[PDB]
Design a protein around this nucleic acid. Structure first.
Ligand SMILES: [Mg+2]
Ligand SMILES: [Mg+2]
Ligand SMILES: [Mg+2]
Ligand SMILES: [Mg+2]
Ligand SMILES: [Mg+2]
Ligand SMILES: [Mg+2]
Ligand SMILES: [Mg+2]
Ligand SMILES: [Mg+2]
Ligand SMILES: [Mg+2]
Lengths: 136, 54, 177, 104, 84
RNA sequence: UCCCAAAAUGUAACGGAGGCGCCCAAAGGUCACCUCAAGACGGUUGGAAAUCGUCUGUAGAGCGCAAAGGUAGAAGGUGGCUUGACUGCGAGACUGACACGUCGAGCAGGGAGGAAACUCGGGCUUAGUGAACCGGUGGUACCGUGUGGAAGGGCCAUCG
RNA sequence: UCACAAGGCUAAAACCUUAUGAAACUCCGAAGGGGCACGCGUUUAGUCCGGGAGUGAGGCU
C-alpha cells in the first residue's frame, strides 16, 4: 500500500522494464505485458484474491510496490492555483516486469489464483515458471 | 540602512592626524562595548591610526 | 625511578617467560591517563576548581579541562563547556604516581581484594578506572569538601591479553581470584 | 603526521616560482640538504654529511650549510627556496640556513 | 454550484540565472586576464599561468594557449602553454 | 539555492521544495600548529547520549545562517602578531536591451604577518540590497553676478 | 541520500544472501550538442558606419 515518509509530488514518462524480468522467491510467476500504472488497492485486490484462493497458506510474493504519488485537483476548480494534492499511489509497472510470485502450490492452483488476479488487473498478463537464472 | 539598529552600527573612524579625513564601518556594541582603535592609511600624509568618532 | 629498574628486571623475566627474539619486542608501559569526568550534572565552576586541586595534588602535573563534544541530546547537554578533566602521565611522573599507587593506593582501599582479571583492550592493552577518592596517599577529607572518584588508563604495548596480563601482574598488581 | 611535510611541500609552489628549492632531512643524526630545479626531475647541487662529519652531530649544521652554498657558488645558483620538512625552523636547520644565507 | 478558492502556492520562486561553466576551452588562444572558468568550487584547479579569484574564477596570467588536464576525476587543472 | 531545463549557456507556468533584507573587532590579514562523524572492546559520577583509552576510520563530519558546488596537502579546530575590512589606479575578460553587476594581473604611495619565497586592497563561494532627485555632516578653496570679502553653490567623502 | 520485496541474524538498529523504485539519488554514462583551429573542400553569406522602418495578440502538427 503506502510508503511511510518521502518528498510529496512527482511526474510521468515510459520505456521497457529495468529489473527484473526473472523469477526469484518462487516456482510460478505473473508478468505484466503493458506499460500501466498500478494503484495500491489494485494490488490489494490481487493479494486478497490469491490469498483467499490459496486458503492457508501457500506463499505469496508481491514484488511490485507503489512509491509514486498521483494527484487530482479538487472538484470543480479552474486550472492553476496549485498542484493537486495526492489522490492516491501508483507503481509504474513496465512490460515484462514480474508482478507476482507464488509457490508452495500446484500448477493448477497457480494458474487459477493467477487468472483470478488477472481479471482484477488494468492490463494483460502472462504466467511463467523459472529457468531465468540471470542470477540468484 | 534602517534606524532601530541595536546590534552593529555604522561608526566613523576619524583620524588623530587632524587632517580632516575619516573612515566608516560597523561595530557590534556587544563586543566593542567601549571604543574602537584602528591603524589605517591617511592620504593626507602616510599611515596615522584613528579613533571611533560618533 | 626505582620502579624503572624493576621494569628492567621484569624485562628478562618476560624474555625468559615468553622467549622473545628481542628485548625491545617485550611489553612496556606507555602513559597512564587520569580522567575526571564530573560535569553534565555538575556544572559548578567551584567543583572543577576542586577537581583541578585534587588532581594537581595527587598526580603532580597540571590537568586539562576536556570540554563537551558539543553533542546536545534531549537531557542536559550543550556546546563548548567543561564536562571532564584529563591529566596524561607518561615516563617519569607516570612511574612515580604508579609506584605511589601500588604502594599507598589499592592497599589503603576500603574493602579491597584485587581488580577484574577478565580481558580488557583485546587489542592487547589494559585500562581500569577505580572508584572512590577516600582511599588515598595524598587525598584527605581533611582538605576537601564533598566526595568524588576518577578514571585511570594504562597502555601496555603488548600484543595480546595474556602478555599484557603478565606484564601488569609481575609489575606488582592484585588480580582478584 | 605526513601532513606538515606535504603541506609546506605544496606550499612551495614547485615550478611557477622560478627559484630552486632546497631540501633538508635532519631527523636522523645525518641530513642531506639537496638543491632541486623542481620542474625538471633533476637534482642540481647537494651536500650530505655521512661521508665524514668531523664529529659534531647537530653543531655541524652551519658546516653543511656553508658546504652546500659553496657548491652553489660553482654551479651558479644565486636564487633559492627553503623546502623545510616536518622541521620547525629553529636550531639545526636554522643553522644550515643562516650558514647558506651568508655563505652563498 | 461554484467554488470559492481558496488555496494558492507557497512556491514559484527561483533565482536569476548564474551563467557559469567554462568560457575558454581546450586549445584556445588567450589574452592576458581572459577568464576561462566560472565555477562554484574547486571543480577546476589552476595550473601554470592561471590564477583564481574569490569566485573560484580561473583567469589566465600571461597570454598563451589553453590546455586541459583531467587528472583522473575530481582533480583537474587548466593551464596555459605559449606557442613555441 | 535546487528540480523542471531536453549532458554548452538560456528558457515559462497561480509548476515542485527551501532560505535573505544579516552576522563576525575576530568569524578578517598573515604566521605557526592541530584532523573529523560513527561503530567495537574496557572504563568513578555515567551507564540512550556524558568525560578517558585502545582498534577501525576519505570525509559516513565541520564550514555563523538556505541549499548547491566545493574542501582532509584545508576552506575544517587552536594559538602569535595584527588593522589590506588601505589611498591613487587598472592591462584584460565574464555578463546584461540599457543601466547595473562580477573576476582581475600589474604600477605607485604606504603599511601587516613571516627567517624568508611570499601573501594581504575583507569573510570557501553564490543572497544580506535602493537609480536620481532634494537635504545633514567632515574636509576642499573650483565659481562667486563693479572689486575685495562673506551668504550660496561646486568638488572628494559621507549619512537619511 | 530517501523509499522498498521475501529471508537470515541479533536486542529493534547495524550487518548477511536474495530483490527493486527515484524530477529535486549517482559507482558510472552514451547518441547528440556547444566553444576554438584549420579549409586539407564545397558554397555563398558575413561585419561595421549612417538614413527609414514595422513588429512586441501568434496558430497548428
Ligand atoms: Mg541541451
Ligand atoms: Mg519566452
Ligand atoms: Mg523630482
Ligand atoms: Mg559643505
Ligand atoms: Mg562654503
Ligand atoms: Mg566497475
Ligand atoms: Mg505587450
Ligand atoms: Mg506577447
Ligand atoms: Mg509562444
Amino acid at each position: 500500500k503506502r510508503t511511510k515518509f518521502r518528498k510529496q509530488f512527482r511526474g510521468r514518462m515510459t520505456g521497457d522494464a529495468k529489473g527484473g524480468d526473472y523469477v526469484a522467491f518462487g516456482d510460478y510467476g505473473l508478468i505484466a505485458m503493458e506499460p500501466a500504472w498500478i494503484k495500491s488497492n489494485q494490488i490489494e485486490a490481487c493479494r486478497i484474491v490469491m490469498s483467499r484462493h490459496f486458503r492457508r497458506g501457500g506463499k505469496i510474493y508481491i514484488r511490485i510496490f507503489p512509491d509514486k504519488p498521483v494527484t487530482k485537483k479538487p472538484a470543480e476548480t479552474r486550472m492553476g492555483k496549485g498542484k493537486g494534492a495526492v489522490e492516491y499511489w501508483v507503481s509504474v509497472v513496465k512490460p515484462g516486469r514480474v508482478m507476482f510470485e507464488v509457490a508452495g502450490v500446484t500448477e493448477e492452483q497457480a494458474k487459477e489464483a493467477f487468472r483470478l488476479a488477472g481479471h482484477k488487473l488494468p492490463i494483460q498478463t502472462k504466467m511463467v515458471k523459472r529457468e531465468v537464472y540471470d542470477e540468484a | 540602512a534602517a534606524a532601530g539598529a541595536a546590534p552593529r552600527i555604522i561608526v566613523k573612524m576619524e583620524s588623530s592626524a587632524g587632517t580632516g579625513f575619516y573612515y566608516t564601518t560597523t561595530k557590534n556594541r556587544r563586543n566593542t562595548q567601549a571604543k574602537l582603535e584602528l591603524k589605517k592609511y591617511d592620504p593626507v600624509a602616510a599611515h596615522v591610526v584613528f579613533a571611533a568618532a560618533a | 625511578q626505582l620502579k624503572t629498574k624493576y621494569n628492567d628486571q621484569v624485562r628478562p623475566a618476560l624474555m625468559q617467560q615468553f622467549g622473545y627474539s628481542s628485548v625491545m619486542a617485550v611489553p612496556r608501559i606507555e602513559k597512564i591517563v587520569v580522567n575526571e569526568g564530573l560535569g553534565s550534572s555538575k556544572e559548578d565552576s567551584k567543583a572543577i576548581d576542586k577537581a583541578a586541586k585534587e588532581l594537581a595534588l595527587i598526580t603532580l602535573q597540571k590537568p586539562i579541562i576536556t570540554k563537551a563534544k558539543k553533542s546536545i541530546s534531549n537531557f542536559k547537554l550543550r556546546q563548548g563547556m567543561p564536562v571532564g578533566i584529563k591529566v596524561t602521565l607518561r615516563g617519569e611522573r607516570m612511574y612515580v604516581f604508579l609506584e605511589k599507587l601500588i604502594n599507598i593506593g589499592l592497599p589503603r582501599i576500603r574493602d579491597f581484594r584485587g581488580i577484574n582479571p577478565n580481558a580488557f583492550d583485546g587489542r592487547g592493552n589494559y585500562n581500569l578506572g577505580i572508584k572512590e577518592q577516600l582511599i588515598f596517599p595524598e587525598i584527605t577529607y581533611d582538605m576537601v569538601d564533598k566526595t568524588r572518584g576518577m578514571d585511570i588508563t594504562i597502555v601496555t604495548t603488548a600484543k595480546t591479553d595474556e602478555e599484557a596480563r603478565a606484564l601488569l601482574q609481575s609489575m606488582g598488581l592484585p588480580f582478584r581470584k | 603526521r605526513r601532513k606538515l611535510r606535504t603541506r609546506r611541500k605544496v606550499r612551495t609552489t614547485t615550478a611557477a616560482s622560478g627559484k630552486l628549492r632546497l631540501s633538508v632531512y635532519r631527523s636522523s643524526k645525518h641530513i642531506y640538504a639537496q638543491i632541486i630545479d623542481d620542474s625538471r626531475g633533476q637534482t642540481l647541487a647537494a651536500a650530505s654529511s655521512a661521508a665524514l662529519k668531523s664529529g659534531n652531530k647537530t653543531d655541524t649544521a652551519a658546516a653543511v650549510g656553508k658546504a652546500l652554498a659553496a657548491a652553489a657558488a660553482e654551479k651558479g645558483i644565486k636564487q633559492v627556496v627553503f623546502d623545510r620538512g616536518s622541521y620547525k625552523y629553529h636550531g639545526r636547520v636554522k643553522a644550515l640556513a643562516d650558514a647558506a644565507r651568508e655563505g652563498g | 454550484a461554484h467554488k470559492k478558492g481558496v488555496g494558492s502556492s507557497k512556491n514559484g520562486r527561483d533565482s536569476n540565472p548564474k551563467y557559469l561553466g567554462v568560457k575558454k576551452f581546450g586549445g584556445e588562444v588567450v589574452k592576458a586576464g581572459n577568464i576561462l572558468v566560472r565555477q562554484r568550487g574547486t571543480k577546476f584547479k589552476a595550473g601554470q599561468g592561471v590564477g583564481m579569484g574569490r569566485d573560484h574564477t580561473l583567469f589566465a596570467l600571461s597570454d598563451g594557449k589553453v590546455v586541459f588536464i583531467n587528472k583522473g576525476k575530481g582533480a583537474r587543472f587548466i593551464s596555459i602553454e605559449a606557442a613555441q
